[PDB]
Subunit: 461 residues, 2 copies
């Protein structure tokens, strides 16, 4: 009767259970789950059992994650397992663990394996894998989100205790809203991209899907650290927030788009309807400079970082690509450095305008996605429909912001609604607090069953 | 018997002199000087006399630059005067003063006018203007430096009390070494680029040519300030340095290139021979990551910012360009955004490696230029010979460093040698001190006659 959380695994072990049983159970849940599209490479049971055993003999000293099972987006290098980024021809077999996998496996955590993703981290839908679309936990018709699709599913279903996503567009925040989870997006640089296939290399962040903020946070702190081999790695600053007097920018009502979702529109409002019983002071801000900057990521020159990354393969084997992703990268070929530099000129401008709005607010509260689609709707509007989801997300890394997505409630169809809390760089540890108190105010439950929330609860410092 | 410095103009005025006499004198020195290539637009004497008069009636209250004459690189917008950037067809007549010209004219300073430059700020020689090469103050055969050529000449000759350059490559530091002056390059953002023709727009800094550090510094503080209309404007931080225990990185001896200048090579050494009687502790550092990053500015994708800037004109009238500059910008057309982003990937890497060396040192002491050329040598090797000068300079803005160039001595031919002191961002006010004590240790004189140095002397805080 296991609870697949950090706390939930502490207790199973504190009461005569074994890591070996945990892995056996996890592999039971997996073999039964029946969304065929969560995994690209599961380990041999007897590979994971033999290392479970090896851990049961060890002390749990200096192991904050003793015997904890977790999943890894198949764009993050786990050794022993091949890495494909959902592009079979792109497949390779890493000799070494990505740093943040190394840092985590040494805290005692175990990998069952590589989850499905939107190919090359180019999407927000989960539909762009040859291994197929994962689906929401609450309705097989509806998309898991993207691009870290099978990684949110795995935690929400209860196959694993946490997963590792990656974020550039919204890929570590949108899947978290669609499967009722906490999605932590760290300031870029806090976590190594060493052993991560690059998407938008300057922007990519390694993220954490978890059951609570407190556990996404802790897993972050273990994975967080300077990596000299990561040119874009940054040593941890630690700027903080007020919690007495805290101001919370929301967009203007005209600047509050939902693309026809009445429902989410009513539910985002509900966040503000339950947020008044909070020590959260409201501010109405100009959302344009974020909206407009969010557009630069695909509607600008940045989409060409992806071209540097996969470009060789695109000339070696352009058919081996997801047709959609393919249509997106092949148009970046037309982009010149004039275009590119011009794009940073607009970014610098919007940054000024952004910093203006950062004066009126202490943090940003947004609909993680304005809506959510049926899989078949996006098999037929694979582009326009996928872009709608990046309406409140795509500006976050470009503007050196940090974010945390949390469950925010449910609509009549039984589909969830997640909000994201966006904040300035390195405000991670104190923004994390606020995202707990709010999560525990709106939908104090996680995952497939809106399961009860693992203690501890976050308390200030 | 006027001294054309801030101090020197204080005293002329404190002793019954008039601004009107000052301008009359300045215009006398100009009409007599006989380098035909210092100016692109001089004002009407009567225009400057009538405003001299208007100032003599005013109080000098809140006017730190009462009646002070100064020159402006013809890429900086002064109203009343046209701006060409040394490209006649590019000529326009600004309606408004560039911000830093506005901030300075209001402190009481006066403009005689627009100095010659390397066309579109693309050079370090001074040779690339249709209005002709200015020349060193110490030998007509030898180049003034670039790209802010006529602006250093004007101050060193004594036509004006200070000038305004612009820096991206080394254009506000090299002309200062070749005419025995203090060249102050501010952290980028400190000074507005509003009303400046862009070269490498993300990198351009507005600089100050002066007689002493104390006066380049003061003029900076008046021009220094946030400009909301400048996307790349940054409000002034103010990080500082140690002066007790101060470490001074020099390149390794293998990393000490002079391109055959025995002489400068001996003279840079002399800096280190007279620097021992200083409270300056030596460090030998790895200069590669700076050298290698300096190369990215023209030997990389950045040369394409210039393409955004002038590119239209290059299509409208590509003949109206300086043939050399033209050959440089027309090759940037081949650069893609892949190339561009790839260039920032290198920069991020070298930045890491740079930050390593910034741990071994507190500031960087370098030959402003490894050598210096005859004009005719560069009319015939206009490219390879111009690039040699950027060997210790071109990395400074790319790496968000701040610099100050000072006179460092002379060789047998009677040609001077300037060193540059490069430091981290916003270390301007404290780095400025060190560059005074060193200047007043090596060649405590300024300009054409190695004139005595205007007090005050810099003292810590």
């Amino acid at each position: 009767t296991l609870s697949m959380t950090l706390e939930g695994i502490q207790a199973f072990l504190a009461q005569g259970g074994t890591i070996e049983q945990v892995v056996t159970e996890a592999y039971d849940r997996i073999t039964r789950y029946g969304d065929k599209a969560v995994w690209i490479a599961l380990r041999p049971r007897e590979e994971v059992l033999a290392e479970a055993r090896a851990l049961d003999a060890s002390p749990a000293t200096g192991k904050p994650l003793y015997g904890v099972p977790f999943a890894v987006k198949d764009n993050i290098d786990v050794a022993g397992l091949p890495c494909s980024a959902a592009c079979p021809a792109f497949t390779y077999e890493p000799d070494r663990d990505a740093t943040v996998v190394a840092r985590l496996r040494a805290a005692g955590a175990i990998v069952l394996g590589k989850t499905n993703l939107d190919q090359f981290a180019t999407g927000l839908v989960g539909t762009r894998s040859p291994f197929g679309a994962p689906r929401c936990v609450f309705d097989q018709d509806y998309i898991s989100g993207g691009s870290s699709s099978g990684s949110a599913v795995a935690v929400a279903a209860g196959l694993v205790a946490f997963s590792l996503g990656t974020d550039t567009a919204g890929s570590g925040r949108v899947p978290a809203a669609f499967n009722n989870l906490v999605g932590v997006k760290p300031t870029k640089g806090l976590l190594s991209t060493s052993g991560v296939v690059p998407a938008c290399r300057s922007l990519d962040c390694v993220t954490v899907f978890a059951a609570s903020v407190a556990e996404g946070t802790l897993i972050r702190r273990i994975a967080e650290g300077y990596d000299a081999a990561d040119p874009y790695s940054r040593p941890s600053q630690k700027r903080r927030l007020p919690h007495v007097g805290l101001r919370v920018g929301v967009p203007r009502q005209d600047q509050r788009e939902f693309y026809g979702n009445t429902a989410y529109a009513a539910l985002y409002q509900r966040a503000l309807d339950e947020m008044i019983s909070l020590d959260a002071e409201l501010v109405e801000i100009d959302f344009a400079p974020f909206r407009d900057a969010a557009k630069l990521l695909y509607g600008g020159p940045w989409v060409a970082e992806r071209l540097e990354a996969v470009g060789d393969h695109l000339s070696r084997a352009p058919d081996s690509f997801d047709p959609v992703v393919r249509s997106i990268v092949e148009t970046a070929k037309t982009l010149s450095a004039v275009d590119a530099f011009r794009g940073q000129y607009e970014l610098a401008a919007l940054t000024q305008q952004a910093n203006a709005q950062w004066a009126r607010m202490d943090i940003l509260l947004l609909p993680t996605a304005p809506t959510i689609h049926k899989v078949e709707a996006v098999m037929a509007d694979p582009v326009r429909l996928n872009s709608q989801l990046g309406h409140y997300t795509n500006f976050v890394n470009l503007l050196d912001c940090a974010a945390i997505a949390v469950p925010a409630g449910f609509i009549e169809t039984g589909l969830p609604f997640g909000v994201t809390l966006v904040g300035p760089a390195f405000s991670d540890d104190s923004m994390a607090l606020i995202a707990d108190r709010l999560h525990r105010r709106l939908e104090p439950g996680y995952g497939q069953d809106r399961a009860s929330l693992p203690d501890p609860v976050l308390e200030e410092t």
